[PDB]
Amino acid sequence: GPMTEYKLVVVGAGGVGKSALTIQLIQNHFVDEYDPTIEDSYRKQVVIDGETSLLDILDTAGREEYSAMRDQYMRTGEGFLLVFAINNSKSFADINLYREQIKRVKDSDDVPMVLVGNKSDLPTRTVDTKQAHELAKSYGIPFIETSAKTRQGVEDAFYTLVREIRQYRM
């Protein structure tokens, strides 16, 4: 097949590591600073399961004052990475509100989505793996624990989302 564009959207509460995960996938660099996002775009040609693919990534705002931009990016977005931080239990509750809003504006029960539990490198957590696996299990979506700091699970999270989109297209 030809190299197609896949429109990935990274969503989640402020400071969960949406930008750090995208930057790690794009160029293998960990950003220690917190540079709050409004709305960034990334484009990169990668090979997934032997197929050349063009990743178009929208790295969105977690800050609540930018909430009005959500309806436009949710309509245009094709697949969604739902990111929460494993040491932030409010971000885990917020990730369920993103999941619901995506289904409302897109009017579909099966929009391609991957639940991502970020900051797995931290010595302690406030959201246990069983809680997150239980939530993704009820919605029939994959769940991957990641660390933008060590790169653990980063490629897996974005590539699993591409695979979810591939099945949804059919």
Binding site: I26, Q27, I38, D40, S41, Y42, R43, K44
Partner: peptide, 15 residues
């Protein structure tokens, strides 16, 4: 390539 909010053009980030 990367385009920050408010930028007119894309810049290289994968070189």
């Amino acid at each position: 390539f990367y385009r920050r909010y408010g930028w007119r053009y894309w810049v290289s980030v994968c070189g």
